[PDB]
C-alpha cells in the first residue's frame, strides 16, 4: 500500500480562481498505490458538499463539486487513510466574475511536453485591457514569457521542466479571468516525438491574399513528427471559433481548410502532441476579396 503514488490534480483543488456556480473539477491518479481505498470529502462553508464521482479508467477517478457560496472549501483526499499530495487542499471560491476584458486560448492551456514550450494567446475583447498577470503553479516552476503583438493580442508561453499538471493563471486587473486557472497536463514524450519536424504550408496561412467566404487552404506534413495527435484551432479576432476542416490523408499529411466569414484578423494555431509546430501561431489578415 503506497499512498505516495497517488496524485490529486485539477482546477477544483486550486487555492484561487474557482468561482461560485462553476463546476469545480479534479481527478486522482491511483495506479501504483496498490491495495487500499480512496476517500474524497469536500467541505464548504455550510458543511458537507455533494461530490459526483466517475471512474475514468486506468486507476484515475474524476470528481466534481458545485460551490454556491463564496469562501473557504477544503478537499480531503486519502488512500489507505493517509493524505495524498498536499491534502487537505484549501480552496478559496470567489464571487461571480466581473465584466471580462480579455479571452485566452491555445494549446498550452490544456497540455504540453517536458522541455518544450506550452503556448497560448490572450486577446482584448474591447480597446481596454489594463494589466495582465501570469503565474504558473505546478510540480516545479516554469519560466514564463510574453510578447504584446500590437494587434490587441499577446503571445504567452511557459516552460514546464517536469511531468505533471500545471495551473496556468491569467489575471485581468487582479482577478483570475473567466475559466482561469487553466489546467494543463504535461507529459515526458517518447523518443520518436519531433514536433519541430512538422511543417505547415499554404495560402490559408499567408499574410496576404486570404479573402472572406472562400476556403483558406493549407497542408500539414508530419511524416517525421513521430506518432502524436494533430490539433488545429482557428478563431477570428472577436472570440468566435472558426469552423476549420482537417482531413487525415492516411500518410502522415493532413489537408486543412477554414472559411473565414468576417474580414478581420484570424489566428491559426497548429500543434503536434501538444507542442506548437514551427511558425505557429499564424496571424492572417482576411480581406473582402
Amino acid at each position: 500500500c503506497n499512498p505516495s503514488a497517488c496524485r490529486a490534480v485539477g482546477r477544483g483543488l486550486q487555492p484561487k480562481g474557482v468561482r461560485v456556480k462553476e463546476t469545480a473539477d479534479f481527478k486522482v491518479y491511483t495506479k501504483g498505490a496498490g491495495s487500499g481505498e480512496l476517500k474524497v470529502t469536500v467541505k464548504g462553508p455550510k458543511g458537507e458538499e455533494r461530490v459526483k464521482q466517475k471512474d475514468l479508467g486506468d486507476g484515475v477517478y474524476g470528481f466534481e463539486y458545485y460551490p454556491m457560496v463564496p469562501g473557504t472549501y477544503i478537499v480531503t483526499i486519502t488512500w489507505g487513510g493517509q493524505n495524498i499530495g498536499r491534502s487537505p487542499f484549501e480552496v478559496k471560491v470567489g464571487t461571480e466574475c466581473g465584466n471580462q476584458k480579455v479571452r485566452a486560448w491555445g494549446p498550452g492551456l490544456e497540455g504540453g511536453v517536458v522541455g518544450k514550450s506550452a503556448d497560448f494567446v490572450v486577446e482584448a475583447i474591447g480597446d481596454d485591457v489594463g494589466t495582465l498577470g501570469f503565474s504558473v503553479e505546478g510540480p516545479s516552476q516554469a519560466k514564463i514569457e510574453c510578447d504584446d503583438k500590437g494587434d490587441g493580442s499577446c503571445d504567452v508561453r511557459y516552460w514546464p521542466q517536469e511531468a505533471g499538471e500545471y495551473a496556468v493563471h491569467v489575471l485581468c486587473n487582479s482577478e483570475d479571468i473567466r475559466l482561469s486557472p487553466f489546467m494543463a497536463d504535461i507529459r515526458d514524450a517518447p523518443q520518436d516525438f519531433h514536433p519541430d519536424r512538422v511543417k505547415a504550408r499554404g495560402p490559408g496561412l499567408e499574410k496576404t491574399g486570404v479573402a472572406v467566404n472562400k476556403p483558406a487552404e493549407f497542408t500539414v506534413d508530419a511524416k517525421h513528427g513521430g506518432k502524436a495527435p494533430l490539433r488545429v484551432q482557428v478563431q477570428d479576432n472577436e472570440g468566435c471559433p472558426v469552423e476549420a476542416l482537417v482531413k487525415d490523408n492516411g500518410n502522415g499529411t493532413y489537408s486543412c481548410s477554414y472559411v473565414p466569414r468576417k474580414p478581420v484578423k484570424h489566428t491559426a494555431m497548429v500543434s503536434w502532441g501538444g507542442v506548437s509546430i514551427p511558425n505557429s501561431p499564424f496571424r492572417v489578415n482576411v480581406g473582402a476579396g
Side-chain angles (χ1 to χ4, degrees):
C1 175
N2 188 19
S4 93
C6 295
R7 308 157 54 220
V9 289
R11 187 168 184 275
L13 307 179
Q14 297 311 302
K16 87 179 28 162
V18 179
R19 292 178 189 276
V20 293
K21 299 190 178 163
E22 300 187 325
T23 296
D25 68 290
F26 58 96
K27 52 189 183 178
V28 182
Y29 294 73
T30 70
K31 185 186 280 281
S35 191
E37 311 194 3
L38 179 68
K39 300 288 200 271
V40 173
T41 293
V42 177
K43 295 306 198 176
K46 302 181 146 146
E48 186 76 4
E49 282 290 337
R50 179 177 56 245
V51 176
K52 178 188 184 174
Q53 173 175 331
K54 267 184 44 182
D55 190 331
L56 302 180
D58 298 305
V60 184
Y61 296 82
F63 301 90
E64 294 185 348
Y65 58 111
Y66 311 96
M68 291 303 296
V69 189
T72 297
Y73 296 68
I74 298 166
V75 185
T76 298
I77 305 179
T78 65
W79 182 270
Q82 233 193 301
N83 284 300
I84 296 168
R86 292 152 299 196
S87 165
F89 300 87
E90 194 180 307
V91 178
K92 177 76 153 351
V93 173
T95 192
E96 290 101 340
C97 61
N99 259 229
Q100 296 293 289
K101 302 185 200 217
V102 297
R103 271 183 211 103
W105 63 280
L109 298 183
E110 61 184 289
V113 169
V114 171
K116 304 306 289 174
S117 82
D119 294 54
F120 61 106
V121 186
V122 176
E123 310 182 319
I125 295 303
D127 46 313
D128 200 28
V129 175
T131 295
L132 303 176
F134 309 109
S135 71
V136 186
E137 316 297 336
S140 53
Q141 186 60 59
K143 169 82 184 298
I144 302 161
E145 331 164 36
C146 52
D147 177 355
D148 177 345
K149 308 308 281 185
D151 64 349
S153 77
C154 172
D155 287 334
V156 185
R157 334 174 256 240
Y158 63 98
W159 299 81
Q161 294 289 333
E162 169 182 356
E165 200 161 275
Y166 285 74
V168 185
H169 291 268
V170 174
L171 309 179
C172 190
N173 309 352
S174 303
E175 290 274 355
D176 276 272
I177 66 170
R178 187 190 294 285
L179 311 170
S180 181
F182 301 94
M183 302 306 302
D185 280 341
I186 305 306
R187 72 198 172 89
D188 198 35
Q191 187 63 58
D192 69 2
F193 191 53
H194 302 291
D196 67 302
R197 304 183 199 181
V198 177
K199 289 191 291 230
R201 288 303 184 293
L205 300 177
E206 285 174 5
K207 13 160 264 192
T208 175
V210 172
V212 281
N213 297 305
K214 188 181 80 220
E217 297 182 318
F218 68 89
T219 59
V220 181
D221 174 5
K223 286 173 205 179
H224 307 295
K227 159 190 73 185
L230 183 68
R231 183 78 172 94
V232 176
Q233 183 168 19
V234 182
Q235 302 196 353
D236 64 19
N237 65 348
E238 204 169 7
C240 299
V242 168
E243 189 157 346
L245 311 174
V246 171
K247 305 177 277 162
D248 181 346
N249 296 321
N251 70 338
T253 74
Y254 297 83
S255 292
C256 302
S257 65
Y258 57 98
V259 179
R261 298 292 175 191
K262 295 177 213 178
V264 301
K265 172 184 74 157
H266 282 57
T267 313
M269 295 186 199
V270 188
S271 63
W272 191 248
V275 171
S276 298
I277 69 160
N279 306 325
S280 182
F282 304 90
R283 286 174 166 81
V284 168
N285 302 294
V286 181

